[PDB]
């Protein structure tokens, strides 16, 4: 109940570091390859005894393009997250001027908390994750091809080259596991690169809807 929880926290942290790196944020190669022993060293080893506390695991990263773009990853201690803790996190994000945040919950999040997350969307973009979903990195599964987020200029070039309207592309849901992993919203286009047994390689595009 303690070694297992420590292993779980280490796995969640590793997956979150991989996710942050994949989204373009700055992460050092040592954080990505941090061993379980290094986790027990830097952080505690008795989560039951409060070492480490989930509040000790919060991370803050900055984008590679502009340091002004920053993201929190919070680990609420309470297995079910309600509006109050969301308001707390929003308050500190506002205080520090951070517009993005990931919230890793244990059991889930109350329906009203989800409604709050979506309500303050345009100002603050904060996303929810079950820790069970973060115990592995789904982008490393053999069934998951490489997904790449396209820039607006790239999307314009694509639609011009193939003379398509957006609604003619294949679709991906915003609630898709990979879409949530990359944090892409409605109207963005993800480029998918997969091997093919006939051509060798094949690029397809999906619009987020």
């Amino acid at each position: 109940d303690d070694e297992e929880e420590t292993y779980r926290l280490w796995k969640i942290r590793k997956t979150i570091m991989q996710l942050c790196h994949d989204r373009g944020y700055l992460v050092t190669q040592d954080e990505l390859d941090q061993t379980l022993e290094e986790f027990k060293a830097q952080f505690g080893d008795k989560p039951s005894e409060g070492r480490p506390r989930r509040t000790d695991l919060t991370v803050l990263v900055a984008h590679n393009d502009d340091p002004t773009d920053q993201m929190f990853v919070f680990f609420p201690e309470e297995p079910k997250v309600g509006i109050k803790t969301i308001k707390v996190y929003c308050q500190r994000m506002q205080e520090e001027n951070i517009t993005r945040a990931l919230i890793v919950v244990q059991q889930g999040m109350t329906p009203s908390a989800k409604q709050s997350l979506v309500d303050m969307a345009p100002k603050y973009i904060l996303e929810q994750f079950l820790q069970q979903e973060l115990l592995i990195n789904i982008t490393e599964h053999e069934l998951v091809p490489e997904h790449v987020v396209m820039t607006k200029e790239e999307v314009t070039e694509l639609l011009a080259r193939y003379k398509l309207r957006e609604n003619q592309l294949p679709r991906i849901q915003a609630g898709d596991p990979v879409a949530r992993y990359f944090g892409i919203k409605r109207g963005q286009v993800v480029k998918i690169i997969r091997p093919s047994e006939t051509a060798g390689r094949y690029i397809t595009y999906r619009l987020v809807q």
């Binding site: 700055l26 992460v27 050092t28 190669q29 919060t58 991370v59 803050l60 900055a62 340091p67 520090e96």
Partner: peptide, 29 residues
């Protein structure tokens, strides 16, 4: 040339470590 890119990694390693300490007070604060 490969050594040059080795230097850049440390620069980015520094560029992140430098701001982690500044951030660290922020997560504390």
């Amino acid at each position: 040339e490969k050594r040059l890119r080795e230097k850049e990694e440390q620069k980015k390693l520094l560029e992140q470590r430098a701001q982690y300490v500044e951030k660290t007070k922020n997560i504390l604060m």
